[PDB]
């Protein structure tokens, strides 16, 4: 059993919309720090404060505090505000105290759980820089070539100081997910002032630009990609207890054989508004179901050739997402319609995958009948499209 350590009202800055929203927050001794639209009447690692760095600031609002987290390879920040500096002090103190208690118990246990783990490869010059893939608040993602092997990777280069809080996340390659369609970490190293993550880069091209070229995917082809995405998100949800939050078509790549890769290239933005779930827009509470919304948008895009909700004006886009009922092309069939309307329920509690069953609900949906999920996981499904690359070093889809 987990104990509420401290609870109360806080103003929370929106993570996409940047208004201030009063929310009722519980800090628990397992490290969870979670906000609610109302004091709940009765656990995702996304909400953990363990391993955080705590900042006190006075901009844009007085008495604000920032929790900053490295989650896998991405820096995440949550910003809060209270009325009085005395209140801020009690909150930051409770948060620190909970975390310290987590560190102190982890290290005692692992100190005894040590079995010739008491033993004592790569640097920047090993790599050729090729292409900026993204920039963000605290770093950048670049396409590199490993000079010794000719192999291509994405390298994520982050400012060491925003992550580490006077001490110091290097054996992370040992915590790799055992899932084929997630992006695996190959190396992680640090420089004097940077922390670098070298991760796989699929060379079968961007699904965004395969879909653009082809206009639409058949229901069978979208079934294939959807099944692979579902397998990966099921793994994240149930083996890692984390939500992705970032499912969009541009984050989907194909490997040389045609299997999905979900990318891990996100950097801090302190946008793609068309993929945001309604509860994320309203900064209501969110959990595993936000990923099933994204699945719904991505597969609507695959089978219909356009977004379920779009407007060039972001404000009417948000209203469409929040308010408008989904329309389908007339040539779409009823198993696809049922899946998509279920994944795009606006109420996360009514959405397919939004119950205790999580991904099993989707896995059991009519649209996926006949899919052998063990074969999906094992890459025994035969891809409907093989990209035009010779080996894992044919740069067809970059150059």
């Amino acid at each position, epitope marked *: 059993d987990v104990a509420i350590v401290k609870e109360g009202w806080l103003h929370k800055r929106g993570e996409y919309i940047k208004t201030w929203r009063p929310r009722y927050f519980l800090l628990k001794n397992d490290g969870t720090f979670i906000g609610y639209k109302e004091r709940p009447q009765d656990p995702l690692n996304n909400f953990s404060v363990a391993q955080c760095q705590l900042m006190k600031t006075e901009r844009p609002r007085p008495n604000t505090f920032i929790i900053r987290c490295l989650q896998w390879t991405t820096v995440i920040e949550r910003t809060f505000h209270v009325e009085t500096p005395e209140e801020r002090e009690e909150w930051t103190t409770a948060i620190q105290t909970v975390a310290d208690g987590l560190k102190k118990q982890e290290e005692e246990e692992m*100190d005894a759980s040590a079995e*010739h*783990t008491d033993m004592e490869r790569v640097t920047m010059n090993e790599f050729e820089y090729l292409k900026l893939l993204g920039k963000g608040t605290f770093g950048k993602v670049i396409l590199v070539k490993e000079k010794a092997t000719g192999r291509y990777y994405a390298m994520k280069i982050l400012k060491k100081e925003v992550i580490v809080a006077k001490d110091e996340t290097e054996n992370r390659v040992l915590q790799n997910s055992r899932h084929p369609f997630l992006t695996a970490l190959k190396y992680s190293f640090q420089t004097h002032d940077r922390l670098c993550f070298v991760m796989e880069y699929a060379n079968g091209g961007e699904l965004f630009f395969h879909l653009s070229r082809e206009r639409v995917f058949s229901e069978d082809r979208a079934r294939f990609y959807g099944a692979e995405i579902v397998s990966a998100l099921d793994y994240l949800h149930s083996e890692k207890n984390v939500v992705y939050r970032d499912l969009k078509l541009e984050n989907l790549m194909l490997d040389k054989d045609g299997h999905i890769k979900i990318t891990d290239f996100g950097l801090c933005k302190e946008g793609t508004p068309e993929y945001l779930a309604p509860e994320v827009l309203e900064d209501n509470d969110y959990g595993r179901a936000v990923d099933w919304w994204g699945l719904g948008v991505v597969m609507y895009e695959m089978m219909c050739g356009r977004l379920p909700f779009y407007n060039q004006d972001h404000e009417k886009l948000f209203e469409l997402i929040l308010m408008e009922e989904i329309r389908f092309p007339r040539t779409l069939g009823p198993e696809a319609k049922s899946l998509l309307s279920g994944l795009l329920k606006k109420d996360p509690k009514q959405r397919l995958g939004g119950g205790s069953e999580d991904a099993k609900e989707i896995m059991q949906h009519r649209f996926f009948a006949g899919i052998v999920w063990q074969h999906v996981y094992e890459k025994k499904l035969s891809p409907p499209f093989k990209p035009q690359v010779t080996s894992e070093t044919d740069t067809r889809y970059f150059d």
Partner: nanobody
Framework: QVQLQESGGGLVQAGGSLRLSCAAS????????MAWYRQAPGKQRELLAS???????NYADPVKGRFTISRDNAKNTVYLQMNKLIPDDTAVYYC??????????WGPGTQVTVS
């Protein structure tokens, strides 16, 4: 002052013997896998011996039979007993727990030179 402290070093003649002692101040060696290390003027730091919480011991090849790792829970101290010493054993010796090891935290070490 939470810290690990090594002593017992000095000059020894090859084929000699020495007992190194690691005095823990603010830590409990009972609850922690303890280990011994050494580092020579150009080499990497070397895992030498570890004593599990159970008392199980294990050694790296260059040392088995010759050195013995021992925990003494009553004194909160660990020991390296070094016998049949070799010039290639000359180095600075450290003792550590798992947590301090991965955070690169070290006591002062003790120098052992043999020829």
């Amino acid at each position: 002052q939470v810290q690990l402290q090594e002593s017992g070093g000095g000059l020894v003649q090859a084929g000699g013997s020495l007992r190194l002692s690691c005095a823990a101040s603010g830590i409990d060696v009972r609850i922690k896998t303890m280990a011994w290390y050494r580092q020579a003027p150009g080499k990497q730091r070397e895992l030498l011996a570890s004593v599990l919480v159970s008392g199980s011991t294990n050694y790296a090849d260059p040392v088995k039979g010759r050195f013995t790792i021992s925990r003494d829970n009553a004194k909160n101290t660990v020991y390296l007993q070094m016998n049949k010493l070799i010039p290639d054993d000359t180095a600075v010796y450290y003792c550590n727990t798992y947590g301090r090891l991965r955070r690169d935290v070290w006591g002062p070490g003790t120098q052992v030179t043999v020829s």
